[PDB]
Amino acid sequence: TEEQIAEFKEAFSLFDKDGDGTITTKELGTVMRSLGQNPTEAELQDMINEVDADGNGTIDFPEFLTMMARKMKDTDSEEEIREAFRVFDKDGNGYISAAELRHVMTNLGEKLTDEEVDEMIREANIDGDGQVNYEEFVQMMTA
Numbered sequence: 001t002e003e004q005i006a007e008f009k010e011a012f013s014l015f016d017k018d019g020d021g022t023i024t025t026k027e028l029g030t031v032m033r034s035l036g037q038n039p040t041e042a043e044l045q046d047m048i049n050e051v052d053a054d055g056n057g058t059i060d061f062p063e064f065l066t067m068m069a070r071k072m073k074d075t076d077s078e079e080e081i082r083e084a085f086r087v088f089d090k091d092g093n094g095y096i097s098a099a100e101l102r103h104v105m106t107n108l109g110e111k112l113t114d115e116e117v118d119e120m121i122r123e124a125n126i127d128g129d130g131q132v133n134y135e136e137f138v139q140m141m142t143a
């Protein structure tokens, strides 16, 4: 963890421009900008409120660190799921068709008829294209 807080410390300093130990809507603002995004003060204020646990109006290390921890898990999630999607989507076309789910389902040890695969697509197909896209996929995986 020692070398972990250090890493986190490094990330915190980019934001803490004047090094007083807190991040302000203005400091958050200059970083967003240096990144090519010019948020309004109102949008900046919402970004701070979300992380500000004690309501003093700024974010300190412990608050950042704790925001950061939780969110690093969820990006390690979206990434596992973004993976499975890619193995399913044999023709990297953005969509999982019946032919594709059937092929991979057979490699998982289940030989399904076209009818059973059809039923799988249906169940998860929202926009009704008869295909499963990333969006439909995650809702199917997670929820």
Ligand SMILES: [Ca+2]
Residues within 6 Å of the ligand: 015, 016, 017, 018, 019, 020, 021, 022, 023, 024, 027
């Ligand atoms: Ca500061």
Ligand SMILES: [Ca+2]
Residues within 6 Å of the ligand: 052, 053, 054, 055, 056, 057, 058, 059, 060, 063
């Ligand atoms: Ca605070």
Ligand SMILES: [Ca+2]
Residues within 6 Å of the ligand: 089, 090, 091, 092, 093, 094, 095, 096, 097, 100
């Ligand atoms: Ca495909």
Ligand SMILES: [Ca+2]
Residues within 6 Å of the ligand: 125, 126, 127, 128, 129, 130, 131, 132, 133, 136
């Ligand atoms: Ca669809």
